[PDB]
Design a binder for this molecule. Structure first.
Ligand SMILES: [Zn+2]
Ligand SMILES: [Zn+2]
Ligand SMILES: [Zn+2]
Ligand SMILES: [Zn+2]
Lengths: 337, 333
């Protein structure tokens, strides 16, 4: 079982089980982790088998992630508790007050993460910290609330729940996707940095302070700060996110599928990304990995490691048998109806 | 004032008033219409001035469109009635029953179209006929309902309202954007789409829907080309099988351009949209051959607003319209 450091590329796979070609690809030093999609999911039993065999290829084990937010962003459905859209928690905040909503967000996080950890998943790419300005359809119900104070506190409560199911969090989309319109393309947020500090960046600050492991940048240009999109901007990622905010976690790149690949990757690392995502294009991963120079980043190993699931298979299966977890499942299922 | 047929390209503009360069571009025979966005809107007074000067360049007048659906897809805010997201009407259907929800959809259509016609706009790109399978975030609240029967009936009621404000409708996104994840491939069979997602498109086409926008989605069991570039979807299924006689607008071709345009026309689109990239419109239009389409002129004409300058301003003064505005405003709060 080869001992290889986790590389700075997050790739993906085609269907329900690894091909021999995928096995060889995932052994390349360039690769440190995998993102799964709905096309990789048939049922719980099959997913466990898939994650186990990904994990087995090398050490430290490849990090496995998925987009389980809730509502209309939940890759794995059959055998999982159906998760409410995050705005449902924003609505509880409005109706029953902040305390009830925090408690509810805690439960949602616990159920979401715990069911994924049972299947060998390390991390869910959640929460959305984007504010509901009432402008962006693609975000839409995925946002907790309009108010940055509610988004922050519900995001923290969700994160505590996620940690009870073994997972860290990944905030998105830095520095804020909520103000642009998004219903079709690369959109423009025309506001000043001061305006974003007052609202959209506040949850990112708060979450970073409280141990958020990772961040995904917005596919959005903010011309008052930089004409480069956030994912390709030294200003956003190094000046603002690292130095000013103090964030020590992973910065994922923008999806590099959109020079060529290699050039797109180099620009992302230069802008300050730790890891680059390359999805639905194993040909580009092949092109990228051949003769690839792993850029100098002594912080990469620890950043990957921080996202490893803290819970073992058996401890999570055991806690899923308890009355307390079953009650959490029923509660969370009820918020999704 | 040049007499030029409306070409098969729908282009756009940069800001609040036409530049001299945009005037020259919009005079090119390739262009037949304009889509406006939020960046083109400051207030009602300025919009009227903008549409008037677009209209004045040539005859027949360039068709002007906009994405006013409701909720988080509503380009023009200040001075307009704020429109509810379409799922709000789906929720009324569930709570208060189909009849209340149809009545509500009627009012929303009327207010949406009427306020846009007052500003010189011809068409809103609505309704979304995509089903709420709970899969697609980009559609999200923009969909009426999960059930194809409710989507169809609310889309019909909305369409009747739109016609009272002078507008035809444009159903989207054919053959159905609701099942894919959207935050892309729909892996289902044609039989599965006939059973649900295509039903509203059939119903709406049967009841006189004038236009359709195809999905930026590949359905590999029917064709590995996306719906917008598929002879199978647009000619075999939409024209011959369904019997649709209206406009097929392309999806946004901004992703060379000439080749992308040719494929869309060959696949069966009437008109191609090219947005946020006036450089690509320039590239496209230079030495452009307007493809053979004897139905194009009449298809454009059918989308012209049916109400005049005076007629719409007059109906906006009536008690009945004011009541409609208040009702619709209330659904959006
Ligand atoms: Zn669309
Ligand atoms: Zn985006
Ligand atoms: Zn995203
Ligand atoms: Zn789409």
């Amino acid at each position: 079982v080869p001992h290889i450091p986790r590389g700075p590329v997050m790739a993906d796979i085609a269907a329900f089980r690894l091909t021999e070609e995928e096995k060889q690809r995932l052994l390349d030093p360039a690769i440190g982790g995998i993102i799964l999609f709905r096309r990789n999911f048939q049922n719980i039993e099959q997913l466990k088998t898939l994650t186990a065999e990904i994990k087995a290829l090398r050490t430290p084990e490849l990090i496995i992630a998925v987009d389980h937010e809730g509502g209309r962003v939940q890759r794995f459905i059959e055998g999982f508790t159906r998760l409410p859209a995050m705005n449902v928690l924003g609505q509880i905040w409005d109706k029953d007050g902040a305390s009830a909503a925090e408690t509810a967000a805690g439960q949602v996080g616990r159920v979401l993460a715990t069911e994924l950890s049972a299947c060998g998943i390390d991390l869910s790419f959640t929460p959305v910290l984007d504010l509901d300005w009432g402008n962006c359809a693609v975000i839409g119900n995925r946002s907790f609330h309009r108010n940055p104070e509610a988004v922050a506190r519900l995001a923290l409560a969700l994160q505590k729940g996620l940690a009870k199911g073994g997972m860290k969090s990944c905030g998105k989309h830095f520095p804020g996707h909520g103000f642009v319109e998004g219903d079709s393309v690369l959109p423009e947020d025309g506001r000043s940095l001061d305006e974003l500090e007052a609202a959209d960046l506040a949850p990112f600050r708060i979450m970073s302070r409280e141990g958020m492991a990772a961040v995904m940048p917005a596919h959005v240009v903010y011309p008052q700060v930089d004409t480069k999109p956030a994912g390709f901007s030294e200003i956003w990622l190094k000046q603002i996110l690292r130095r000013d905010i103090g964030f020590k976690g992973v910065i994922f790149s923008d999806d590099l599928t959109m020079g060529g690949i290699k050039e797109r990757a180099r620009i992302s690392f230069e802008a300050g990304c730790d890891i680059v995502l390359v999805c639905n294009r194993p040909d580009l991963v092949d092109e990228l990995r051949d003769g690839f120079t792993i850029p100098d980043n002594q912080d990469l190993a620890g950043r990957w490691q921080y996202m490893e699931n803290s819970l073992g298979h058996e401890a999570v299966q055991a806690v899923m048998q308890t009355m307390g977890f079953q009650a959490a499942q029923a509660f969370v299922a009820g918020l999704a109806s």
